[PDB]
Amino acid sequence: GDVEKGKKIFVQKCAQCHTVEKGGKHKTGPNLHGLFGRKTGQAAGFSYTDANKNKGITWGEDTLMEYLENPKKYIPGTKMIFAGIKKKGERADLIAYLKKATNE
Template sequence: MTVKIHRLGLAAAMLMISGTLAADATGPLSQYQPPLSESFKQQLREADLAAGENTFMRKCSSCHDLKQEGGHGKGPHLWNLMGRKAGTVAGFEFSAAMRDSGHTWSINALNYYLTNTEQAIPGRLMDFRGIRRDAERANLIAFLSQFNDNPPALPE
């Protein structure tokens, strides 16, 4: 009986280790290009833009705006966010972590960032933990994607 328990313990430990290794394969956006799941792509295609605007107003607008021109608030303006290299918009002083992240904002990168901001860009100054619910993130990302000189196509 002890041998069986030991073997089950070893199997559980191996699963735990392989799960940890898979989680470590993600990491910061400076070293990781996140994919979009098929289910998240579907949620983007079916996004509720009014719900995305509501999320923006509740969770983002106190620091960010969507104006095409003008100054920044506590955070940088988000017009032309998609396709912009992180930490580069003129007139805003970004954290070293954001400037050094080296990524360009895309639907994939924004989804990953909004899922877990600390994991995506460790050491960033933005005091925001993320949005855990996929549908809420999809609505917000689809809404934000509109505020761009050349709005990106949603993934097929």
């Protein structure tokens, strides 16, 4: 994926609710640093729904591709209010950005 393009997607669709940096603050949504390889609902210090805590998958390219297409379908009852990104290339670019940003 294209990290530069992914950053712009993130800014447009995600950044209002999420930070990515190490030590970044929780906002409407949890800080996303360290997500890759982590189970759902594991950012420290954030009140997740039980739905997000219980989903139990490991975040990575495959699961992010599916989630980000339609978040509430993947985690019904989530309090993340975002309808999804339909396009596969846009999700891949966003996920490439996330892989860099959330592991710096």
